[PDB]
Amino acid sequence: KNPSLRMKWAMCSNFPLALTKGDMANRIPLEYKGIQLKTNAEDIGTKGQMCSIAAVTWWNTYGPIGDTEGFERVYESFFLRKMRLDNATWGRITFGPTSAEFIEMLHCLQGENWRQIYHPGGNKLTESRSQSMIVACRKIIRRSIVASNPLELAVEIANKTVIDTEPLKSCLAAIDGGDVACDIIRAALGLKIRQRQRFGRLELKRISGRGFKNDEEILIGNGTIQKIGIWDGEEEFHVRCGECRGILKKSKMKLEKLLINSAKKEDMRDLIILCMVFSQDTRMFQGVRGEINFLNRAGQLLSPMYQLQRYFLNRSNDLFDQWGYEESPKASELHGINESMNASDYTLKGVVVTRNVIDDFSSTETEKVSITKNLSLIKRTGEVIMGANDVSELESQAQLMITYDTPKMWEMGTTKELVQNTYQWVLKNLVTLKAQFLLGKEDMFQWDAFEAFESIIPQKMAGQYSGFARAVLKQMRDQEVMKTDQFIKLLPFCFSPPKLRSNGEPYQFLKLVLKGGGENFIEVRKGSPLFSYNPQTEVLTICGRMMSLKGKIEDEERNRSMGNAVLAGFLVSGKYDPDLGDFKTIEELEKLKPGEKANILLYQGKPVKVVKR
Amino acid sequence: MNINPYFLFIDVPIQAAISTTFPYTGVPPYSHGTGTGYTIDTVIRTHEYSNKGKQYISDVTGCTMVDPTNGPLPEDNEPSAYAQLDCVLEALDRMDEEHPGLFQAASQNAMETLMVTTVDKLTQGRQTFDWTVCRNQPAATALNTTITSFRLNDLNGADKGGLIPFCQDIIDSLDRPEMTFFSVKNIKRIPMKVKDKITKVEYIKRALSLNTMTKAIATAGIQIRGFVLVVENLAKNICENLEQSGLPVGGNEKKAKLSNAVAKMLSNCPPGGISMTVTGDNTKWNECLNPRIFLAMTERITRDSPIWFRDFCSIAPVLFSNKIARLGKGFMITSKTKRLKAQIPCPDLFSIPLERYNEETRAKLKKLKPFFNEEGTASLSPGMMMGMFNMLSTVLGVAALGIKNIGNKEYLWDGLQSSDDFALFVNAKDEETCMEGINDFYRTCKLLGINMSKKKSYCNETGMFEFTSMFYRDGFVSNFAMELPSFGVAGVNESADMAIGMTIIKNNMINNGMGPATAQTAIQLFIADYRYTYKCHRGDSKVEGKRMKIIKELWENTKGRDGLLVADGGPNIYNLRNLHIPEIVLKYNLMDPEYKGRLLHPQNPFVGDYDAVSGTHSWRTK
Amino acid sequence: MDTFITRNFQTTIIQKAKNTMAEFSEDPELQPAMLFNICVHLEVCYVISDMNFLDEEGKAYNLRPQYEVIEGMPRTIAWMVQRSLAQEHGIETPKYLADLFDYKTKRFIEVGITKGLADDYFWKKKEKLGNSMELMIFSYNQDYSLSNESSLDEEGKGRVLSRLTELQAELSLKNLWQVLIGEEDVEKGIDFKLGQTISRLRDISVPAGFSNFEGMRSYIDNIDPKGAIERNLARMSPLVSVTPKKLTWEDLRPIGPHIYNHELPEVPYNAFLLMSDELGLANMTEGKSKKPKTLAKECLEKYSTLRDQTDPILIMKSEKANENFLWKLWRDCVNTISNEEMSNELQKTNYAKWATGDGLTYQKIMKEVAIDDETMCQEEPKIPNKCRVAAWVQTEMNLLSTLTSKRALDLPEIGPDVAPVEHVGSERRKYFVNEINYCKASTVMMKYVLFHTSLLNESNASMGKYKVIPITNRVVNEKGESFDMLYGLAVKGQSHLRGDTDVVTVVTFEFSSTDPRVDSGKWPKYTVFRIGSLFVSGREKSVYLYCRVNGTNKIQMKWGMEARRCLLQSMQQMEAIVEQESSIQGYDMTKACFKGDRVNSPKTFSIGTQEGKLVKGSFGKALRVIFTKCLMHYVFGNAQLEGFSAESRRLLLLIQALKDRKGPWVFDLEGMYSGIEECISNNPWVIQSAYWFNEWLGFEKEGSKV
Ligand SMILES: [Mg+2]
Ligand SMILES: [Mg+2]
Ligand SMILES: [Mg+2]
């Protein structure tokens, strides 16, 4: 009644797996490199041959290669599930108080106290170019926002971004579509974009009226005073949101008219909510009975208008409840919608659907807007038209491979592609890096590749790691000759300022761990799953992608011992003397008095001896 | 500084702070209420609450039956089994009034499902008593033994396939003058099958017997499962249409039920009035509910049904009103000076003077003597031993919650029922009338046989309560106990085990309210257990073994290492979003063509719920 | 199958039939033949009813039809319509759910579809139903059976037979005629008869006041019970009442005050292994996994002085212990581990039989001899002692929540995060493991789990002999070094049985640096020898060996192995705290709770008292305290602790209601307190929990006034 223990014991047995009889069953060798894969035993009556799990390993490694055509056809449902998952778009996760394609993701969509917004995808492959362009622009904006002087970083990254094979600038200039992020990037690169006011997902084009912002202290439903710039006077705009459009006529803290056309229910709801929030109706302000402290990915506090926008997008019922209701006229063209966007005469107060098609404002209006430091676009008149706050937060995977040839984007790796890129960058610039290093100049540590590398070093230990690496490099340079492999391995860690202990010496380490451990570590004195080197074949295997290291090596850095650059302040001396004691822990090594001797174990079979300087 | 854990409550609500106080939902290894002493205690307690009612002798079995129903009303606040039939009937009539056609629809649906059910269905349950061997056997084993022994007696109903003929044979076997069966005897020993015979009365006692469990403390035989199935189906059909019923619910819709109940009660409060909620506990729920009341409930529910279905439904409460409790292994008497021990079985409990039992057991036996049959079994006519009629008991509770008023007073009550757990809500004008309503509900419950716990139930203004271990406070919801994943692997095969583990984590975060971080940690722990059990650590690791030696070579040879399965030393790519996709399907696109061909070889010699892709890892073990 | 059903039946019919089937069947998609039958039945019903019409007085042409369709709709509504029609037309309501209602003759109608032949299915339906309702039987082959002449005419008949012929031809030519099932099989079983034994048992299962089951049946079926509840409530005694009382702070008194009685003994340590007093002998390695015997061998080689100590210096002795037996067992374990054999078998099995006390087992005899022997009596139950608070539980809580230099947790990886919820979970896990990686409780939990795993692994065929199970662990420090830690050796006894609950004796000898005489009342269950001295950082520490004869079983071994779920328990509790915090806002508050944002400062908790004043700490300290509390709850778990934790929840919720100003009311507060207090006898965790609850309740009382 304990299957787990039974199976654990069975796997520890010799031949626990039943084996069939046939040509393929007889292709398994009796034993591989001393491992008995199949039993050479004949059962008395059953004639049942057995094998070891090592037999399955051998079959998967060297066994005959069968044909794998039509495999996707048989298991089509599972591949459809994977396709739906991969093509899906992820929104935002909200805390506090169904199609079969959604029940699959129920575990990742609905929680007891949280809810995840999820838009399923699949076979939306026609417009891959525009989708990839918008994904790239959104990622660039997100990266640049968290940086001081976002405009400079955004323009620098956007020039080094390639979608499939065409530069992002070419895609932006050609496609002409996109979203707020695409427009921001275009105006950052000096291109031209269509002229529309932006409030979240709402595109506005004034067609009559005037407004003047007045600073005021308004009270909200939750009972707090907020400083808002209110719009006074009667204004009329053409409003659009996704596939829905309409006309909004508003006045001071009041929505007069909101004519719209039938469209997607979610899109219509978003349009109506954004129109209510933009109207600045006091009826909207009074409906805020929660807490509005939403921040942005930069960590800063959203402005009050966007605070209310986010709140009411999350909690739409709180507004429709405190929005009142009325009865629409029986005109054939005119209609009305309830809180659920249905056909009901009991419609919202000030909102009305219509049958006649409303002409879109999206005429060709290519213009050259001005972009400020914080990714805000302003007309020649000085009025801000869009900003970073209006960029959609939806996330999806690009249908075309996008490559950002810049270290600033390396942070979007998996902590293994980041290491791969960083170490390949060191190897490519190894000659120049070493030439600069052998001059007493240390600005090399400030390069952007090491900036990206520091993003995976534990913040607690980053200073100590950097101090140890810098001390080891200085020892390898000044007082002794250099070892190229250790120089490459320990250079990236040098970015952070040293965090030397009170003793005036660096923290000694046996391994340097990175984010997402288990196998993400660098051995200071031995090969690692993320960085290994062959001292004789001159091969630098980074994550199993062996790269040659011919020429950059030196003849004098081969006879030298690996133990000269394994601990800061310790230089190899003597040999493996079994008189001082066992292989001392690092703890003894830091505590050792200067000039003393110690024993070390570089790896399995290479003892050495060192002396503190 | 002295660390006080309880000070966490000074900064966090107690509902959030006591989340998952128990990491399990099963019985611990130490809190085991099993033994002859516990069974005798249950019998004495059950008859204690009904000793003011009728008592007579059974004309069929000869046991001493006690009937509390329609007995005198209680005069104190002790547990009472003296439910009044008229009050139960009025509650059920009002429940039918509030839901027109619900009783009829439930009866018809249960009847149709019964007409479609097959004898094979009495094999999905837990251990069952076996009269042939007088021992607990798995449902399939007991069913097969009963079918064979019935064929021995010329009762062939299981062959027809339908469950109704099998139940007909079950109840007709009660009229046989004497029943012959196959008994397994350790005749060195060996389990040899012999043709044994018993008389009608002994067989009747065996069919009404409920053995004690050792690994619910009582188990029933196969004679009653067929009828309990239909009775519980009828009860569930009634329960799923009641807004108060909350037992069938599970997952994120349980929180929805709690929130909807709270909001509905708050909205209907009188302007300027007060709404209170009582977190309720029931005392001796199992020991104070009578099978006679359940017979009356089934009779009222199936009023308009055809008589055959009415009788079929009445059979189960009939068989549980005449039940016999087997008292277990017996006691153990030891001589300290002689260093000797011996187990006195149940038939020989009174074969020695009671002065040789400790005080508590001596008193227990003194009280048990009247109801002690001279075979090691006691008579337990009143009470519902353990969970056997959970749906029907929930129906009775919800019927109690449907009265809503007494004497047309200034209060209205509603609530949630989950069998013996419940929450009450009372709307009135002030706390005084609210407590008046709570008192009236307590008295009505007493009249119905339900005993609210005063020592465990309490009250406070609506907006915070607990239901079925789920704490609700201002919308936020927490759980007191959660069955966190056990440790190990399912043990089927390395291909299936990954699917089973990932499905377990997925269902835990769907139903049991597991969080993202907890689920990711569970994934990590399961992968650790998987790699430990199947010796399939990563190919780039430094681990020695027979299979790991070849896994390392496979790692070195393969180029698309991210496509290798975990069983092949490949990386683990499971996260929250992709717990429903087989790992072969996940890694197909990244698999090397040669490795994919070898693994997906239709002619490999190894192959010979959860979703898995057949391959060299879907092997078999003898 | 689904393709044909979609093609030959309109969407409305298919959905209605699917609903009708799903009402009674929990696996509707596993039996499409039934679906075929119901959709055909609905087609026939519509054909009968859709066309035939009527008018006001008698015209069989307005919009009044002559057929009312009760089928195809939810049964709840169907039963209401059936009862309403029967009552309105003064006719009886059939006990079944009819298919149609004929308005010309005012009769319920049942229509049947027969594969074999009509006039045979007709009589079966007559037997099932009888004179309750008329019948219309139409067969696949041209045939019909009607019980009335004024019923369906020839045109509707021709339409329905044409439909049946089309379906039959399609089934025949698409090889699905084998799947068809006659309606008879759905009705299988209506002849259910009660025997003589079951009838007599039924007659004597009726409540008081009924002679036989027929009287009860008639009484329930005919008597209107209106007014029974109020009738019985008016004549019920006033003494039956909840007796509610408005709870106040003054009602909440300290629980289990007897724990403050200084005349009682203080609780002794009774956990399986030493938690905070543990001392592990450390030996660095390269991370390579080793056999437990080899790990112990190398660790004992590194410490030869302790291993070679052959004479005992007894420091403390348990009252009933035999220091000679224990020391000889310890020496046997050391010799067995140090030997070159690949087995962990003890050499002196016969001596170990009596050293562990396994030979002192009572001899089972025949029940007859025992019955005759008047000196054999049942033993009185062991009443758990009543003990007072001991400072060692508070010290254990203080020490186990601190950070150490070693971490025993190394968990595998998971796929990359792509969804925001996954990023939330990853961030939460990052903070949790950062705060918990080097907690002492983590290493203690891993030691417990590994020890119980070793105990269970050695029960395959080694339950009939004496083994030595090293108490081992593997840890890693911040510098990346890996150590094997040996905390002692345990000899695992032998149970001749294999019942999964038979007691197996484990004699544990654990290293420690704690003088047992400093806290005398903590160690009455242990016999302690001073086995040597150790140097750690130039400081000499005495090394004692705590020896104890404990017992366990396979279930307890599995439970101790499961003890690793305290990690998931703490993760879930932290998640619940963070989710409660983020419900007030609309976004995840993990970073704000842990590190603090620009708007939200880092969250702080009250972690204890220093000299009677509240002391605050970060969320990491609170996390460590939560983990330690979970670990101690698991280690000290028993019936008393389970009862205490299940019962004090109600008091805590009452206190929460008092704090929230929800105006709690209680019916039996003294009953609550007695139920809580009956569990405070000798469990150290329960007694310390009562102490902590009393202290925190005093603090809450004081803070309520302000
Ligand atoms: Mg319950
Ligand atoms: Mg409750
Ligand atoms: Mg029908």
Numbering used by the authors:
A (entry chain C): 43 to 139, 226 to 741
B (entry chain B): 1 to 187, 202 to 229, 240 to 632, 655 to 668
C (entry chain A): 1 to 61, 72 to 716
From the paper:
In the nucleus of the infected cell, influenza polymerase (FluPol) uses the viral genomic RNA (vRNA) as template to perform synthesis of either capped and polyadenylated viral mRNA (transcription), or unmodified anti-genomic copies (complementary or cRNA), which then serve as the template for vRNA synthesis (replication). ANP32 is required for both vRNA to cRNA and cRNA to vRNA replication. ANP32 comprises a folded, N-terminal leucine-rich repeat (LRR) domain followed by a Glu-, Asp-rich intrinsically disordered region known as the low complexity acidic region (LCAR). First, it stabilises the formation of the replication complex, an asymmetric FluPol dimer comprising a replicase, which is part of a parental RNP and synthesises the genome copy and an encapsidase, a newly synthesised apo-FluPol, which binds the 5’ end of the nascent RNA replicate to nucleate formation of a progeny RNP.
The biochemical and biophysical analysis revealed that a stable apo-FluPolB dimer is formed in the presence of hANP32A at physiological salt concentrations. Cryo-EM grids made after mixing apo-FluPolB and hANP32A show a majority of dimers with a 2-fold symmetric interface, which are quite distinct from those of FluPolA. Several different pseudo-symmetric dimer structures were determined at 2.8 to 3.1 Å overall resolution, almost invariably comprising an encapsidase paired with a variable partner. The dimers have a 2-fold symmetrical interface, although the peripheral domains of each monomer can be in quite different conformations. The apo-FluPolB dimer interface involves the PA-arch residues 375-385 of one monomer contacting PA/332-338 and 361-364 of the second monomer, and vice versa. In addition, the tips of the PB1 β-hairpin of each monomer (residues 360-363, closely associated with the PA-arch), interact with each other across the 2-fold axis. The core dimer interface buries only ~2200 Å2 of solvent accessible surface compared to ~3600 Å2 for the FluPolA symmetrical dimer. The apo-FluPolB dimer interface involves hydrophobic (e.g. PA/F335, Y361, W364, I375, M376, V379), polar and salt-bridge interactions (e.g. PA/D382 with Y361 and K338, E378 with K338 and K358). In the apo-FluPolB encapsidase, the PB2 lid domain is disordered (as in FluPolA(E)), but interestingly, is observed in its normal position in the 5’ cRNA hook bound form of the encapsidase, due to subtle displacements of domains. For the symmetric partner monomer denoted FluPolB(S) (monomer 2 in Fig. 4A), a variety of conformations are observed including with the PA-ENDO in either the replicase (ENDO(R)), encapsidase (ENDO(E)) or transcriptase (ENDO(T)) orientations, with the PB2-C domains usually exhibiting weaker density.
